[PDB]
Design a protein around this nucleic acid. Structure first.
Ligand SMILES: Nc1nc2c(ncn2[C@@H]2O[C@H](COP(=O)(O)OP(=O)(O)OP(=O)(O)O)[C@@H](O)[C@H]2O)c(=O)[nH]1
Ligand SMILES: [Mg+2]
Ligand SMILES: [Mg+2]
Lengths: 273, 135, 62, 102, 51, 237, 389
RNA sequence: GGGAUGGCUUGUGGCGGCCAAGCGUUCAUAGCGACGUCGCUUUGAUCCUUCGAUGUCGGCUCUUCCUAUCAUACCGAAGCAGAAUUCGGUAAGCGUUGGAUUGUUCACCCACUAAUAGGGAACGUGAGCUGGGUUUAGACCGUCGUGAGACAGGUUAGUUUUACCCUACUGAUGAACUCGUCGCAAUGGUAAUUCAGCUUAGUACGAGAGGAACCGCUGAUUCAGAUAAUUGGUUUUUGCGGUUGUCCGACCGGGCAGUGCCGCGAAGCUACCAUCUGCUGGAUAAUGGCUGAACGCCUCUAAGUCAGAAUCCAUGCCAG
RNA sequence: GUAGCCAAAUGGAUUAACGAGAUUCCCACUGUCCCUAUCUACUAUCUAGCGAAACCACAGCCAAGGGAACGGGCUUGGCAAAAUCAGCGGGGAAAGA
RNA sequence: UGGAAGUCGGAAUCCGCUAAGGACUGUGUAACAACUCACCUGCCGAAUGUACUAGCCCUGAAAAUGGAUGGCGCUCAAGCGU
């Protein structure tokens, strides 16, 4: 197995995580709206339920602009049975849910007015939008934001108000023995530039995305399998090697990057009640 | 038993670790990427290398996806580097090529395209049975 | 592996020398000696039979 | 020390047959020749000792990160080795039983 | 082979089972090269009539 | 082969012809061999051999004494308590350890250096001994955290022994009452030798004269937790 | 601290110092042990390296993959004109080693061996051994007789003095090579009588050595001059544009002693080293007067061992020659010392008999394709200068 | 202006109780106490609990040493049938590799292999080369401060540049003894290594599955020393030929473009990219014995003595 | 909502072009490497002429000991033979250190 | 106990005949048998056995360039005690 799929499981990253947990009173667990139960960290939830009941865990469903509003409301309804959930589109210029999240943090600070301040640490998978949430709450680009996973390598304090601190943390991936490298790559753990044979994960993308969405995305139709799809995409876009041979590897890397970066429409439907 | 064959005279090793050679049988693979050589020694900084008739450990880079994610034993049957046989003849083929086998030496495929080398033919009796030209 | 200086290897080589290579080298030496025989054959004081004296020190000088 | 203990205990655990995976004839034959409960309890004690040795090693490495002198480091090392030795010492009877079974 | 040194020592005679017109020719040194020419390329059973 | 095949071969064919004689001669040479080992082994092998021989000699002396002596519970317990494994069971209000070694602040604290320059600030202090941080503990932020109590040095349970009952139970630590070296060490919760701690004694089965259940008592730490990796305490009764 | 990855040492300490040889002619350090039950024989000989060529051999090696097949092998030709025996040295045993008691010379010595005793022979009066030659005539050789009796009754090791006939070689050198050759076998009296019988006589190479024998070759290697560590010891080159040099050793020292070790690879003299290489098989001893000595039983081309156009930088081989499988320590024109093997052989390769099928006599001055000039003319045909002549 | 713990360490926990040969005490029957023992620290599971850089490491090249031995040699024991091993002993002669991974204490994985053992000579401060701790001057973000600025921090770019001296080392000459030829050998160095195949033999052994070994033979790995017949490489052989631009009026024959460029190219040098070669005696260690006392049995040991490891010392080999 | 409603086509900062800015990857390419070899010019080399400087208490082979963890001079050993040339970078010297 | 006879186990462990002999110290059998030990007698022939104490000697842990009772060397000392 490639060493890139072990990213997010490092001793340094988990030392950073436990440092943030020990230093934080409120823990914002950030979920991808396209895969909430996929991005949920029941490992950290079990640790918080077992060892630190005094720390307040709050769900933040980020990237709700990439999913239908009905599915977002259903996922909020599912998660609010366990923990208080806030939907948010993290952006400096055009945010959503910023006022509700600010009000909830102000309520927590009012509850802990005996302290000098409260600390709110952000946890989740890589590339779920933790730095974007901090930047959107501050209204100013204070934390680095990139579509490349693992942009945040160390923890960082940002002073939100006089009594509210925000703690940015690197993204963690808890180890699961039923998790596959294809599952991790589709969740967004790794960079597809550093993976070998990207073509094999294209059937997973074609399963997750409806066919007509791919048709309007790439203005292409008539493929019977992923190899033909990548070949016609390479010939259309001009991704050719020496002799006009298609650049199927590079086209697959482009498709995987567009799938992760919210350019091809896909979501996981909420389970019906 | 390991894949290194006995009774093999010394010849020039033309394929070090990292070489991509053609896949000369019909197993489904188009090329083999060499990651190791059976019977290689131990020197600092020296890449392991193989010649015609050697068993190597190979990875399929182009071919069927079923063959893609495994390491296969392969036998080098053709090489481009010129080597000498005991009758004084230096010779070489126009490409480097090998066939996928099992650790005992039975072939994965059913037929061989192109000729095979003599050294491969004596050292592996299944390749001698599946070769149309021995050359 | 057994080294070159191994006692069992030495005994193996001694048996080989005594039983196998020995007679062959002896016959060759006999033939060469015979050939070089073919090539080679192809008062006491006043006669030199009594070996007289020819015409740093170990002691202290005295 | 923990790596050596884990290697030996894992070899013992993986080498013995798994009664849940056997054919009914072989499983019931081992249940007749050997007590199946005793067999499973002995191997469970082996696995428990292996896990506890790993836990003790992790705890004492974490303490040795903060140890400040050679005397304190030596006391922590001897403490870890003695606790692992005590864990092995409580396994006197399962090892004899498993050697006879082997 | 066992009576004559064993495997790896015994030297087999390949010309013993040759079938020739005269068995005295079974251990001849057959000429192969003569003045830059292959003798086998010039071997012809009806050489006398052509000569 | 199957079942006891070496014993069956033993029945059918026996030993080698010199097996008994060689074994007898080896058993005879054992005395010379043991003295040669006692005089010629070197180092750790010799030390282990000496301790083993000492143990065998003591065991042999005990066996001989028992054989010479062959020709010649304690506390009253009811019938349902007979044949079970039971403990042996053996003003100035002074603790068992009234005085310990004093620990200076230079030994207690090490300086954590901060800054990117060659000259670095030194205001942060790190506690080098085990601590009890209490429940509902949230760490101070790094800009206002002077005293660093690392997570791997924090403890929550202790092996507390009751002297009268001779029972040692692992009990949760409730608080740190008095560290003998410094009230700052008491405030930081440092667990050292001679420290008076408050322990949860619910598992010990202690009731008061009024019938109320006593679930908090005082124990004294009787070891060095930084050297031992564990907290051992004795109840003050 | 310890070196992280183990690696075997570059070069051997058995061949130190890597300095020039003290003498151009190779020294026989040891002779085979003397067995008095053997008949008297000579243990060494000299020749001149002429060059190399190719053969085809019908291999009879049971157990090998090339058994009953033809193998192409490289061989070295040594031109061996017969030596002349001119002297006899007696050696005694002392608690300080072997000691030369006396030596006896022949009545007549050649000019080429008298040249060895001079540096300016052309200006010389050539008086060497002239007063010695009168000892054979005075008193019927009484002094010669008493020296022979002294060797007979006091000595244990007898060596002849033998020199080469360098005038039969194409070399421009006229000064011959003189060496001591031990007489092994027999009693000391037999050795003395044998040497006196061999005085002033030529000894050919085929009465000292025989085909299928494995011998030792002693010679001085090709000189390379002053050579850096990379070629001299085989060290790994430093990366490209390394400061202060890349064909160097990065650390001659990094530890105590505060010194440079004798075991550290350093630049210096490479080549011109004295070497004794053992176990070389003789494939043919060809005769000088035989005109078809490069012919075999299956190659009926009647030709000599000299390649077409001659040996490059040597000339023609006109005397008896020895064909040796493989390579020898020296170079062309160089004196070679052939010696008997010190011990009885332990291989089947020494017991193998050689059957040559063909010997390459094509030109080594290029890509020669013809074995004889008649073959070249037969392939080419009639040329313009043929009709012009 | 002033500076830059150590005959330490190793393999076996701590606290509390009990027992305890013994030391003591036997006007007090207390107190120390090895060996032990007892209490605390999942029916082969779970995988939904990774718990703090103030202390900084590396890589290359290359040499040597230690043994606390992974492999190779020999040996002792084990239900060790065989095969494969496990535990231990003598042993450092000889080896101990190739890679992926920096969203990071770079340590874990993968394969080849006989095996991929661990350390020192720095790290008890410290000029061979080069990446990180690491930090002059430029700049940005985060935290703190009203601010100059400082830092919990994160990112980016950034000047030390010997050797011709002494010694050591590697090579090369040399006065004195007339010049030269042939020698000896004190002393110093020292070298080979591992695997596979054939036969034994589908035999011993085994219910079956399977499955050896000594003797003999043939190759290969790693190392070492040479060599250039052949095959590749290299071309100022500017040897021959082709070709662009320009110049000598054209042709011929040439110049220039620092070897104009290109094809072949002898010779020389070179490459496990080519070929050849690498050798035998004595004494031992662990152990296994013979004879035989101590000690009327017994005993490989005490006197005497046999055999035995890749070990030691030499020969073969290099210097002289 | 497998893609809705409301707003004057769009719902954007996931901002195009530009860059001796920093980073990852693919094809091609190759002496970066396996694993080194060869050729040319200028040096280095030797000669004629010309001709400095840095630096310099005195000097220069090691081993063990020399309490103040330091020896080059002391003690005890090993040893130890004129005068030299080309190189090397261990040590001493040597960084406007 | 399938079998268990002193000798796979659990618990008892007595008497007779005795010169003396365990409800057995080991080897052995499927169990027996058989051998052996504890103990006794005959032969022999004069001093021994056990446990401690004090001297001297060996072991009672060692790394890494080649070296140190100062060096040679020393064994009824040129070591140790008077
Ligand atoms: N469509 C959409 N994209 C978002 C939103 N929030 C964040 N993103 C994108 O998600 C990407 C990854 O999130 P980040 O801002 O890097 O935060 P993160 O989850 O901590 O990622 P890491 O720092 O790598 O761990 C960013 O490039 C944003 O552009 C959102 O609300 N909607
Ligand atoms: Mg982030
Ligand atoms: Mg990111």
């Amino acid at each position: 197995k490639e060493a890139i799929f072990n990213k997010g499981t490092s001793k340094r990253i988990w030392n950073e995580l436990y440092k943030v947990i020990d230093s934080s009173d409120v823990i914002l667990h950030v979920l991808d709206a396209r895969d909430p139960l996929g991005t949920r960290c029941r490992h950290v939830e079990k640790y918080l339920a077992a060892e630190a009941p005094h720390k307040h865990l709050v769900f933040v469903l980020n990237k709700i602009d990439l999913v239908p509003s009905s599915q977002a409301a259903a996922w909020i309804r599912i998660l609010q049975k366990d923990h208080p959930t806030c939907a948010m589109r993290a952006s400096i210029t055009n945010p959503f849910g910023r006022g509700s999240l600010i009000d909830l943090l102000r309520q927590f600070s009012v509850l802990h007015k005996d302290r000098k301040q409260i600390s709110v640490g952000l946890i989740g998978y890589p590339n779920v939008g933790k730095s974007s949430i901090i930047n959107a709450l501050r209204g100013k680009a204070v934390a680095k934001v990139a579509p490349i996973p693992g942009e945040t390598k160390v923890w960082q304090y940002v002073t939100l108000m006089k009594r509210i601190y925000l703690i940015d943390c690197p993204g963690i991936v808890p180890p699961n023995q039923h998790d596959t490298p294809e599952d991790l790559l589709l969740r967004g753990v790794v960079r597809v530039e550093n993976v070998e044979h990207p073509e094999q994960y294209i059937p997973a993308v074609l399963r997750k995305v409806k066919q007509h969405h791919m048709e309007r995305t790439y203005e292409l139709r008539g493929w019977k399998d992923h190899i033909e799809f990548l070949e016609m995409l390479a010939r259309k876009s001009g991704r050719l090697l020496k002799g006009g041979e298609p650049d199927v590897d590079g086209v697959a890397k482009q498709v995987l990057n567009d799938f992760m970066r919210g350019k091809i429409p896909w979501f996981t439907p909420a389970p019906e009640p | 038993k390991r894949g290194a064959p006995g009774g093999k005279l010394k010849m020039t090793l033309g394929l070090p670790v990292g070489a991509i050679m053609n896949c000369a049988d019909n197993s489904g693979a188009r090329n083999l990427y060499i990651i190791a050589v059976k019977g290689a020694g131990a020197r600092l900084n020296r890449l392991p290398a193989g010649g015609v008739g050697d068993m190597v450990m190979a990875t399929v880079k182009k071919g069927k996806p079923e063959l893609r994610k495994k390491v296969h034993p392969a036998v080098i049957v053709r090489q481009a580097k010129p080597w000498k046989r005991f009758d004084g003849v230096f010779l070489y083929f126009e490409d480097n090529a090998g066939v996928i086998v099992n650790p005992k030496g039975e072939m994965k495929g059913s037929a061989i395209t192109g000729p095979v080398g003599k050294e491969a033919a004596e050292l592996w009796p299944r390749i001698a049975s599946n070769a149309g030209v021995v050359m | 592996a057994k080294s070159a200086r191994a006692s069992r290897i030495k005994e193996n080589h001694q048996r080989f020398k005594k039983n196998i290579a020995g007679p062959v080298e002896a016959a060759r030496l006999e033939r060469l000696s015979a050939k070089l025989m073919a090539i080679a054959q192809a008062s006491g004081v006043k006669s030199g039979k009594s070996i007289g004296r020819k015409d740093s020190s170990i002691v202290f000088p005295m | 020390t923990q790596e050596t203990c884990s290697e030996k205990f894992g070899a013992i655990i993986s080498s013995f047959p798994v009664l849940s995976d056997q054919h009914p004839f072989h499983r019931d034959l081992m249940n007749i020749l050997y007590d199946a409960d005793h067999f499973k309890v002995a191997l469970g004690q082996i696995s428990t000792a292996k896990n506890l040795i790993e836990t003790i090693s992790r705890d004492y490495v974490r303490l040795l990160k903060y140890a400040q002198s050679l005397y304190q480091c030596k006391q922590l090392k001897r403490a870890a080795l003695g606790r692992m030795a005590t864990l092995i010492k409580r396994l006197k009877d399962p090892l004899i039983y498993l050697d006879q079974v082997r | 082979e066992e009576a004559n040194g064993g495997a790896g020592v015994f030297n087999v005679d390949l010309r013993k089972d040759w079938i020739l017109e005269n068995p005295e020719w079974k251990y001849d040194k057959i000429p192969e090269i003569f003045d830059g020419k292959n003798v086998y390329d010039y071997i012809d059973p009806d050489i006398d009539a052509k000569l | 082969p199957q079942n006891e095949y070496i014993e069956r071969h033993r029945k059918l064919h026996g030993r080698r012809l010199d097996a008994e004689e060689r074994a007898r001669k080896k058993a005879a040479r054992e005395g010379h061999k043991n003295s040669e080992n006692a005089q010629n082994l070197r180092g750790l092998r010799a030390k282990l051999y000496a301790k083993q021989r000492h143990a065998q000699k003591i065991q042999m002396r005990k066996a001989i004494k028992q054989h010479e002596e062959r020709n010649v519970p304690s506390d009253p317990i009811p019938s349902y308590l007979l044949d079970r494994a039971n403990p042996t069971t053996a003003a100035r209000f002074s603790v068992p350890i009234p005085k310990v070694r004093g620990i200076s602040e230079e030994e207690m604290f090490k300086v954590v250096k901060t800054g990117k320059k060659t000259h670095k600030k030194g205001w942060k202090r790190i506690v080098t001994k085990p601590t009890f941080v209490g429940p509902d503990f949230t760490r101070r932020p790094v800009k206002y955290e002077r005293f660093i109590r690392p997570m791997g040095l924090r403890y929550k349970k202790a092996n507390v022994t009751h002297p009268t009952l001779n029972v040692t139970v692992q009990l949760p630590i409730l608080s740190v009452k008095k560290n003998p070296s410094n009230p700052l060490y008491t405030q930081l919760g440092v667990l050292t030798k001679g420290t008076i701690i408050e322990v949860n004694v619910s598992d010990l089965g202690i009731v008061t004269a009024s019938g109320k259940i006593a679930w908090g008592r005082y124990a004294q730490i009787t070891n060095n937790p930084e050297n031992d990796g564990c907290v051992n305490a004795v109840l003050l009764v | 601290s310890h070196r992280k990855y183990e690696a075997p040492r570059h070069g051997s300490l058995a061949f130190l110092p890597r300095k020039r040889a003290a003498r151009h002619r190779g020294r026989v350090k040891s002779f085979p042990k003397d067995d008095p039950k053997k008949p008297v024989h000579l243990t060494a000989a000299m020749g001149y390296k002429a060059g190399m060529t190719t053969i085809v051999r019908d291999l009879d090696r049971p157990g090998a993959k090339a058994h009953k097949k033809e193998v192409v092998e490289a061989v070295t030709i040594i031109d061996c004109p017969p030596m002349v025996v001119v002297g006899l040295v007696g050696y005694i045993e002392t608690p300080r080693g072997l000691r030369s008691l006396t030596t006896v010379w022949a009545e007549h010595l050649s000019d080429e061996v008298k040249r060895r005793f001079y540096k300016n022979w052309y200006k010389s009066k050539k008086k060497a051994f002239t007063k010695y030659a009168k000892k054979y005539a005075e008193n019927n050789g009484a002094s010669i007789t008493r020296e022979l009796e002294r060797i007979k009754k006091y000595c244990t090791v007898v060596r002849v003095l033998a020199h080469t006939q360098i005038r039969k070689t194409p070399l421009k050198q006229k000064k011959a090579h003189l060496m001591e050759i031990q007489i092994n076998g027999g009693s000391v009296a037999d050795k003395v009588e044998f040497g006196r019988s061999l005085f002033e006589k030529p000894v050919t190479i085929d009465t000292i050595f025989e085909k299928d024998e494995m011998i030792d070759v002693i010679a001085v290697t090709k000189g390379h001059g002053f050579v850096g560590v990379t070629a001299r010891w085989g060290t790994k080159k430093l990366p490209r544009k390394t400061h202060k040099g890349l064909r160097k050793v990065a650390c001659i020292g990094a530890w105590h002693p505060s010194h440079v070790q004798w075991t550290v690879a350093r630049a210096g003299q490479m080549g011109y080293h004295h070497r004794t290489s053992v176990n070389h098989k003789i494939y043919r001893i060809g005769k000088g007067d035989d005109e078809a000595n490069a012919s075999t039983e299956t190659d009926l081309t009647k030709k000599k061992i000299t390649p077409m156009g001659g040996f490059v930088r040597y000339g023609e081989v006109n005397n008896d020659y020895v064909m040796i499988k493989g390579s020898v320590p020296g170079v062309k024109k160089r004196i070679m010392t052939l010696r008997k093997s010190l011990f009885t052989h332990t291989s089947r390769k020494a017991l193998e008999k050689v059957e040559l099928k063909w010997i390459d006599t094509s030109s080594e001055f290029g890509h020669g394709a013809f074995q004889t000039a008649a073959e070249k003319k037969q392939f080419m045909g009639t040329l313009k200068k043929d009709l012009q002549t």
